Amino acid sequence: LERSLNRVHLLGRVGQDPVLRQVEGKNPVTIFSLATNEMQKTTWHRISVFRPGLRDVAYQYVKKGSRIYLEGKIDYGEYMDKNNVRRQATTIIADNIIFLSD
Amino acid sequence: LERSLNRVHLLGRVGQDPVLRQVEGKNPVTIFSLATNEMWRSVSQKTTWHRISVFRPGLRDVAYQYVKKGSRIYLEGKIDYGEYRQATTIIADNIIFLSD
Amino acid sequence: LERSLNRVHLLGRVGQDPVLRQVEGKNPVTIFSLATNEMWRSDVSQKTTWHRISVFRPGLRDVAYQYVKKGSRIYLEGKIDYGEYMDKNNVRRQATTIIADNIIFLS
Amino acid sequence: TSLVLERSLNRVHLLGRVGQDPVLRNPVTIFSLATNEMWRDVSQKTTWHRISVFRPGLRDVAYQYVKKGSRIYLEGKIDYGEYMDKNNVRRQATTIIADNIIFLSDQ
DNA sequence: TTTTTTTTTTTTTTTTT
Ligand code: NA
């Protein structure tokens, strides 16, 4: 079968402290938000880190205000809202993170 | 002042012929869909559908004229979440034709 | 009563199209940048000195705004001025300019 | 190392009074020179130039014979001494790098 | 869902002890 490509790279600033989500059914995931600012037009990205090891590094060292570079893939995710309606959410699943500030 | 990066690279198959729209108060904008696939087992393919927008003058003409249903292309651009809810789109600034 | 001398002569290449700066309370002035380049062989190195040129004199100010262009080669003469301005934080800063009183077009 | 390709000119001529005794700082002899313009009662505008003498030999001549209140003629080139301050903002430290000095009188 | 932070796009090439 022919192959495809789905890769993203981002460089920006973290909006809030990361959170480590553990759902009884599923693997743990580190979640945080990343702003990429054109200069002001700000784009807010939802980052997910599933990969073991990087997930814990991200949870330990990513902080509010941190500048980071990351690489990953785009995922158009799904969730049920409070009314149990099938919703759409986009996340960047990161597989490499480089820390850029102290 | 401080610089950011927001770049996407996609390579996949176009879903339908492109169309011309007004988007974000700008027009014309050339819109089409692109599928990228991943192999999974435990074989089968997970298809990710991307909404591609071409705002750039000239390139939007190229996209409308030459991108076709079932075309294979490589493209580059930036992510815009098209919020109002989300309507995520890849705003393309580079397109390489591979096969039709 | 004793007299001084403050003269500079430059021959070089213009870096950008000139601007006619007009400020409330001030005389108009034509501004542009001039590079004086030195190329040296040991393989070939370059040293570029970038000068800020101001033209206040009427007539020459308008000739300079009309005919000085990015990339133009020119000879000029003038005097050195260590000008003062204030940044956003109200700190006194220095900006050097060559106040030109003669310009000869070479290209 | 010799000059090649398109040539430029960067030459300053000053005549004025030395402000303080020169000091030693690639050793370099440094001093200040005042050039004055008359303006209209009758007032003066003083321009203070930072003189650097890098050239061997002449740097020692300057340190030995240039004194506070000396009147001199000098020639050289402008160097803007660009650098980065604490916040990565470009600053100037303009200096006239002198290569010819003619003594006129001292106090 | 709310949220982040601040180093940045000037020159030419017919010729030189
Ligand atoms: Na700054």
Judge whether C36 and C80 are in contact, CB under 8 Å: no
Domain membership flag for residue C1: no
User: How far is Cα C42 from Cα C30, in angstroms, rounded to an integer?
Assistant: 39
The SS3 call for residue C97 is strand
State which residue of chain D sits closest to C78, comparing Cα positions.
Answer: D12
Domain membership flag for residue A3: no
Query: In 3-state terms, chain D is what percent helix, strand and coil (to 5)?
Result: 5, 55, 35
Cα A84 to middle of ligand 1, angstroms: 50
Residues preceding chain discontinuities in chain C with C to N over 2.5 Å: 42
Tokens read off for D98: 């002198």
User: How far is Cα D105 from Cα D107, in angstroms, rounded to an integer?
Assistant: 7
- For residue A80, with 0-12 CB atoms within 10 Å meaning exposed, 13-18 middle and 19 or more buried, which class applies? exposed
Cα D88 to middle of ligand 1, angstroms: 6
Judge whether A99 and A66 are in contact, CB under 8 Å: yes
CA-atom Rg of chain D in angstroms: 16
Query: What are the φ/ψ torsions at residue D64 (nearest 5 degrees)?
Result: -80, -45
The SS3 call for residue B5 is strand
Q: From the CA of B92, how many Å to the C1' of E3?
A: 27
Cβ distance B49 to A76 less than 8 Å, yes or no, reads yes
| CA dihedral sign of residues A97, A31, A81, B24 | negative
Cα D86 to middle of ligand 1, angstroms: 9
| Minimal Cβ distance to A6: which of B2, B6, B36 | B36
Domain membership flag for residue C33: yes
Q: Is the Cβ of A41 closer than 8 Å to some Cβ of chain B?
A: no
User: How far is Cα C35 from Cα C95, in angstroms, rounded to an integer?
Assistant: 16
Peptide bond into B28 cis (omega under 30): yes
Domain membership flag for residue D1: no
Task: Give chain C positions within 8 Å (CB) of D78.
Answer: 8, 49, 51, 80, 96
Q: Is the Cβ of B5 closer than 8 Å to some Cβ of chain A?
A: yes
Residues A61-65: contacts with CB within 8 Å, 24+ apart? Answer: A61/A99, A62/A14, A62/A17, A62/A18, A62/A30, A62/A32, A62/A97, A63/A14, A63/A17, A63/A18, A64/A14, A64/A15, A64/A16, A64/A17, A65/A13, A65/A14, A65/A101
Side-chain-facing half-sphere of D4: CA atoms under 13 Å: 10
Cβ distance B7 to A9 less than 8 Å, yes or no, reads yes
User: How far is Cα A79 from Cα A84, in angstroms, rounded to an integer?
Assistant: 9
Query: What are the φ/ψ torsions at residue D61 (nearest 5 degrees)?
Result: -55, -50
Q: In this complex, which protein residues place their C-beta within 7 A of any atom belonging to strand E?
A: A 12-16, 31, 33, 35, 37, 39-40, 42, 44, 46, 64-65, 67; B 1-3; C 12-16, 33, 35, 37, 39, 46, 48, 50, 70-71, 73; D 2-7, 84, 88
Q: B79 to chain A, minimum CA–CA distance in Å?
A: 8
Judge whether A26 and A74 are in contact, CB under 8 Å: no
Task: Give chain B positions within 8 Å (CB) of A6.
Answer: 10, 12, 36, 38, 48
Task: Give chain D positions within 8 Å (CB) of C93.
Answer: 91
What's the domain range around B88?
Answer: 8-99
Domain count, chain A: 1
Domain membership flag for residue D62: yes
Residue B91: how many CB atoms within 10 A of its CB? 20
Judge whether B88 and A76 are in contact, CB under 8 Å: yes
Q: Resolution in Å, one decimal, please.
A: 1.9
Amino acid at D48: W
Distance between first and last Cα of chain A: 45
CA B8 to centroid of chain Cα atoms: 10
CA C101 to centroid of chain Cα atoms: 11
The per-residue DSSP string of D1-32 comes to: -EE-SS--EEEEEEEEEE-S--EE----EEEE
Domain membership flag for residue B80: yes
Bridge partners (DSSP) listed for residue A42: A37
User: How far is Cα C55 from Cα C62, in angstroms, rounded to an integer?
Assistant: 9
Domain membership flag for residue B1: no
The CATH number assigned to the domain holding B26 equals 2.40.50.140
| Minimal Cβ distance to B6: which of A6, A39, A43 | A43
Cβ distance D3 to C39 less than 8 Å, yes or no, reads yes
Judge whether B76 and B93 are in contact, CB under 8 Å: yes
Domain membership flag for residue D28: yes
| Pairing status of strand A41-49 against strand A86-99 | parallel
Q: A6 to chain B, minimum CA–CA distance in Å?
A: 5
Distance between first and last Cα of chain D: 41
Judge whether B33 and B7 are in contact, CB under 8 Å: no
